[PDB]
């Protein structure tokens, strides 16, 4: 079946506010005389019982016109994008109607079908018609309904990956999004495309997007693992080989990022995943990818920092060396560096190290001595700076005495180099 | 004989967006339950005339209850449903309210046919297929376009004699006139005594509305030609003298309202209307409608005082003389008096009313001064008044005045 009646569903599953907006939009359709459809995600999620609040409307006419007309009768702000004929209309409800012109009896579904044929995968290439006469009408040309029932992910034509290699990543993503499995042929096709080099033939920024989006989905580990299964990892970061070890690290990374988040703040997970993929990169191959995915410029140091002290950290964590020792390794590093370190850890090590950081931001207080104190009265710029990190570290397990401490370590300064006053 | 017409541009033209979306939605819902949906009556009329109208009365072919139920699942508000009549009312926010009632498919014909006039018997179909479709079976678009008041069939007035008053009401409302056949049909039903065949309430409501409307003087005068006055109140005969009083009655009602407050016009009309009524004549007229039991006396007061008041307006008597005539009387009665006055006399009587309304302060010295004075009883009121009179002729210290008063009141007779 190409066509199905889903009106019954609409009324059952759709917030009546939205449902009303759907009826209205369809009526404006009839008045201003243009075919009107919801498309894409909403149609998918509707059939899945998933709640979708984004609303893609496609019209067979002119989005701009359609939009202005619809705004006369709807409360809110209508943003126009004259370039490429689309409009985003934000209501009070805090939601947005997207309207866009269908690429160009009536032929109608030679044109909506052409719009739909342009999408990525079957489950996303469906439409429901809003025009009053055909209100319930589900328009599935490409077996995208069956494919929902079957949990299948499937491109629309052979060149789907050739046209937008970015779908290589997208398809992995929708597998984890809904426990869904890329079907036989599109898998063949996906693999052919990563083999021939279509990724490297897509832009850095578009790739970083869909990658950021994967790391935000369910079970990003599973997705990074599926990327490795298809060997896309390589074709994105050429010196990165997803070995059992990298994998072990990736598993550690993701298992800890949560803890890192609740305890330190926003962890940028695209940057954490990079703390692994990019390990032991060479100055040269670094640049390639830095100046290619627009990365921070200083990542190297933080990466190589952990890269180089990993086993040092590991040794300290063994024997349970007291706490002052590891401070220098962590000092003021990214949250995706804490993450990088944690990627080496599991069991006891991962815990004992956890404690360590918990103090380092925690019992880092250094409450009394301050900075204007110290004018008592040493005059240097870096002395005052050193003096303070010294006392801080005593404190990193020190018992008591906020001041009498800076008097016991000044004992280690007047001797040796220090001196003066 | 063009039944159909496309007022859809007009709907999006005049109608408020929020109400339009409501019309859109109502129609759509109709399709969803297989029910023809129309907005009908006065809104259609007013939209055609450019007159703002928030009434939204909807008719449907099917089941207004089922409809109003379905509608509510999507529309926010309160749903009262009058099961027996199969009517219903969606009470919406923004203080808006929508009534719903029930019945080829053009049975909306049989339903519109049973209304009063043609300009109120029109309908706009709401279903998205026919959305701005005006349906005028009876030439309401004609009569509307050309200021005509026409009844739908020859037995309207027989069916509802209250239409006699409404006909007149619409004339002064929109400035239209009753067309010839409907005139003859109304006069008829009036002589056939049909107007008299309707209950008190029904009639009185329409009467208050004719009066709430634009040209009451002309409305009443109009009811006169049609001989409807003599048929609502038996012993009231619309003489050229009754019209004299009406005219001054209505010329002064504004000034009364500006100076004393609201004015029940139904009553102010009854004053003039119900002059000279036998206790029996009044008792039946007060009983039919529900006039206050005391009004008949109030009508009497002015009725009798009139010549004396005129004598006093001429003769320019001191303000103390008029007071008894207007002492705690109703605004209606203050209107009744003014129904006798004009120009010269009128001006002064109003000038007196104002010195009675003010200059009634009785600054300090009231009722405690008297009681402590040693006086108890209903006499305390009589002396307070007798001070007020001297005062509404301008005077001295309230004390010097009570003293001159009581011991003036002492000579005549013992307090």
Short mmCIF file of N, CA and C in Angstrom, two decimals, chain A residues 11-12 14 16-17 19-21 23-24 27-28 30-31 69 72-74 130-133 135, chain B residues 12 17-18 20-22 24-25 28-29 31-32 70 73-76 126-129 131-132:
data_model
loop_
_atom_site.label_atom_id
_atom_site.label_comp_id
_atom_site.label_asym_id
_atom_site.label_seq_id
_atom_site.Cartn_x
_atom_site.Cartn_y
_atom_site.Cartn_z
N UNK A 11 -5.90 11.96 15.76
CA UNK A 11 -6.72 12.37 16.90
C UNK A 11 -6.38 11.64 18.20
N UNK A 12 -6.10 10.34 18.13
CA UNK A 12 -5.67 9.58 19.31
C UNK A 12 -4.33 10.08 19.89
N UNK A 14 -2.20 12.81 18.95
CA UNK A 14 -1.67 14.17 18.81
C UNK A 14 -2.27 15.18 19.77
N UNK A 16 -4.10 18.03 21.11
CA UNK A 16 -5.13 18.73 20.33
C UNK A 16 -4.70 20.13 19.88
N UNK A 17 -3.86 20.82 20.65
CA UNK A 17 -3.27 22.04 20.16
C UNK A 17 -2.59 21.81 18.80
N UNK A 19 -2.79 19.07 16.77
CA UNK A 19 -3.83 18.54 15.89
C UNK A 19 -4.65 19.66 15.25
N UNK A 20 -4.86 20.74 15.99
CA UNK A 20 -5.67 21.85 15.50
C UNK A 20 -4.89 22.65 14.51
N UNK A 21 -3.65 22.93 14.88
CA UNK A 21 -2.71 23.58 14.00
C UNK A 21 -2.56 22.79 12.69
N UNK A 23 -4.95 20.93 11.28
CA UNK A 23 -6.21 21.17 10.56
C UNK A 23 -6.23 22.56 9.93
N UNK A 24 -5.77 23.54 10.71
CA UNK A 24 -5.69 24.90 10.25
C UNK A 24 -4.75 25.02 9.06
N UNK A 27 -6.13 23.90 6.06
CA UNK A 27 -7.20 24.76 5.56
C UNK A 27 -6.61 25.96 4.82
N UNK A 28 -5.63 26.62 5.43
CA UNK A 28 -4.87 27.62 4.71
C UNK A 28 -4.43 27.05 3.35
N UNK A 30 -5.99 24.81 1.42
CA UNK A 30 -7.13 24.91 0.52
C UNK A 30 -7.45 26.35 0.08
N UNK A 31 -7.28 27.30 1.00
CA UNK A 31 -7.65 28.69 0.73
C UNK A 31 -6.65 29.34 -0.22
N UNK A 69 0.68 34.27 4.63
CA UNK A 69 -0.76 34.04 4.75
C UNK A 69 -1.09 33.36 6.07
N UNK A 72 -0.95 35.72 9.27
CA UNK A 72 -2.10 36.59 9.51
C UNK A 72 -3.04 35.99 10.55
N UNK A 73 -3.09 34.66 10.60
CA UNK A 73 -4.07 33.97 11.43
C UNK A 73 -3.44 33.23 12.60
N UNK A 74 -2.12 33.33 12.75
CA UNK A 74 -1.43 32.63 13.83
C UNK A 74 -0.53 33.58 14.62
N UNK A 130 -2.34 17.36 4.79
CA UNK A 130 -3.12 18.18 5.72
C UNK A 130 -4.39 18.81 5.09
N UNK A 131 -4.35 19.07 3.80
CA UNK A 131 -5.52 19.62 3.13
C UNK A 131 -6.80 18.89 3.50
N UNK A 132 -7.81 19.65 3.93
CA UNK A 132 -9.04 19.10 4.51
C UNK A 132 -9.59 17.90 3.75
N UNK A 133 -9.66 17.98 2.43
CA UNK A 133 -10.25 16.91 1.64
C UNK A 133 -9.59 15.56 1.91
N UNK A 135 -7.43 14.67 4.68
CA UNK A 135 -6.74 14.98 5.92
C UNK A 135 -5.92 13.86 6.53
N UNK B 12 -12.64 36.37 5.80
CA UNK B 12 -11.25 36.63 6.14
C UNK B 12 -11.01 38.14 6.18
N UNK B 17 -9.38 37.14 13.44
CA UNK B 17 -8.63 35.91 13.12
C UNK B 17 -8.97 34.79 14.10
N UNK B 18 -9.05 35.13 15.38
CA UNK B 18 -9.31 34.14 16.42
C UNK B 18 -10.67 33.49 16.21
N UNK B 20 -12.35 33.45 13.19
CA UNK B 20 -12.16 32.74 11.92
C UNK B 20 -11.58 31.34 12.11
N UNK B 21 -10.44 31.24 12.78
CA UNK B 21 -9.86 29.92 13.04
C UNK B 21 -10.88 29.03 13.73
N UNK B 22 -11.78 29.66 14.47
CA UNK B 22 -12.80 28.93 15.18
C UNK B 22 -13.80 28.39 14.17
N UNK B 24 -13.17 27.91 11.01
CA UNK B 24 -12.44 26.92 10.25
C UNK B 24 -12.51 25.61 10.98
N UNK B 25 -12.12 25.65 12.25
CA UNK B 25 -12.04 24.44 13.03
C UNK B 25 -13.41 23.77 13.17
N UNK B 28 -14.27 21.92 9.99
CA UNK B 28 -13.43 20.73 9.88
C UNK B 28 -14.00 19.61 10.74
N UNK B 29 -14.24 19.92 12.03
CA UNK B 29 -14.78 18.94 12.97
C UNK B 29 -16.04 18.33 12.41
N UNK B 31 -16.75 17.76 9.26
CA UNK B 31 -16.36 16.74 8.30
C UNK B 31 -15.95 15.49 9.05
N UNK B 32 -15.23 15.68 10.15
CA UNK B 32 -14.75 14.55 10.93
C UNK B 32 -15.88 13.68 11.49
N UNK B 70 -17.84 16.24 20.60
CA UNK B 70 -16.66 16.09 19.76
C UNK B 70 -15.83 17.37 19.78
N UNK B 73 -13.39 18.09 22.73
CA UNK B 73 -12.14 17.34 22.83
C UNK B 73 -10.95 18.13 22.30
N UNK B 74 -11.22 19.20 21.56
CA UNK B 74 -10.17 19.96 20.88
C UNK B 74 -10.24 21.45 21.22
N UNK B 75 -11.42 21.89 21.63
CA UNK B 75 -11.63 23.26 22.06
C UNK B 75 -11.68 23.33 23.59
N UNK B 76 -10.92 24.26 24.17
CA UNK B 76 -10.80 24.50 25.62
C UNK B 76 -11.90 25.41 26.18
N UNK B 126 -20.01 26.07 7.00
CA UNK B 126 -18.65 26.07 7.53
C UNK B 126 -17.74 24.94 7.06
N UNK B 127 -18.30 23.84 6.57
CA UNK B 127 -17.48 22.73 6.09
C UNK B 127 -16.48 23.17 5.04
N UNK B 128 -15.21 22.76 5.20
CA UNK B 128 -14.09 23.24 4.40
C UNK B 128 -14.31 23.22 2.89
N UNK B 129 -15.23 22.40 2.41
CA UNK B 129 -15.50 22.35 0.98
C UNK B 129 -16.30 23.57 0.53
N UNK B 131 -16.75 26.55 2.46
CA UNK B 131 -16.58 27.37 3.62
C UNK B 131 -17.15 28.78 3.64
N UNK B 132 -16.85 29.66 2.71
CA UNK B 132 -17.55 30.93 2.74
C UNK B 132 -18.89 31.02 1.99
#
